[PDB]
Amino acid sequence: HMTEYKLVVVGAGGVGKSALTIQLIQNHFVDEYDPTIEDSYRKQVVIDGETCLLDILDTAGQEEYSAMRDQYMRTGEGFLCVFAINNTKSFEDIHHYREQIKRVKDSEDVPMVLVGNKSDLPSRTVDTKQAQDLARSYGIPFIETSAKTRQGVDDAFYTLVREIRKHKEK
Ligand SMILES: Nc1nc2c(ncn2[C@@H]2O[C@H](COP(=O)(O)OP(=O)(O)O)[C@@H](O)[C@H]2O)c(=O)[nH]1
Numbered sequence: 001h002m003t004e005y006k007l008v009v010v011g012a013g014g015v016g017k018s019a020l021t022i023q024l025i026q027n028h029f030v031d032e033y034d035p036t037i038e039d040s041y042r043k044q045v046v047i048d049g050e051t052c053l054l055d056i057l058d059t060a061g062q063e064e065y066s067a068m069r070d071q072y073m074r075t076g077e078g079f080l081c082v083f084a085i086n087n088t089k090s091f092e093d094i095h096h097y098r099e100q101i102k103r104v105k106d107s108e109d110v111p112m113v114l115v116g117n118k119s120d121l122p123s124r125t126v127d128t129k130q131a132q133d134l135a136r137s138y139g140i141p142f143i144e145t146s147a148k149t150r151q152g153v154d155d156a157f158y159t160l161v162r163e164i165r166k167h168k169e170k
């Protein structure tokens, strides 16, 4: 009656991991969300005729990974690797998040989507072609999002579900 899909949202502080997740669940842009709140959220949604229950960890910070975060990294089926298109450092940081996932999974073939968030903002410092070059090298999709306008948000999450299905029987 429902298929569970366990998703993890990672990336530098301030890129919009929480805003993206909240925009997915609540259809609202939250302007100011606690940067330290790490928690799991659930969403029921029909994707390609399948009733899915998304179990989504929105990660926050470093320093003594909770039991929960360690659990989700280990048992997570797919990862959204988020940077902001007006945050060059966040883009450069993606390498470290991908290295972490590769280590936790002992594999280069983990379901993953590269997300360039804050597409609504005029201060773009990361070109779509840069992002495309990075995702091409990793062998993953790249999608641009705005948690403010909702552009691409469903698309990122649905695409990650689809990547998981490409990798394993669900
Ligand atoms: N304009 C714009 N602001 C955003 C977007 N996503 C997040 N923000 C803002 O960016 C800041 C960081 O967002 P947050 O979701 O807390 O980042 P996190 O640390 O990655 O969870 C907040 O002030 C949000 O209001 C976006 O798509 N567009």
Ligand SMILES: [Mg+2]
Residues within 6 Å of the ligand: 017, 018, 019, 033, 034, 035, 036, 037, 058, 059, 060
């Ligand atoms: Mg957050």
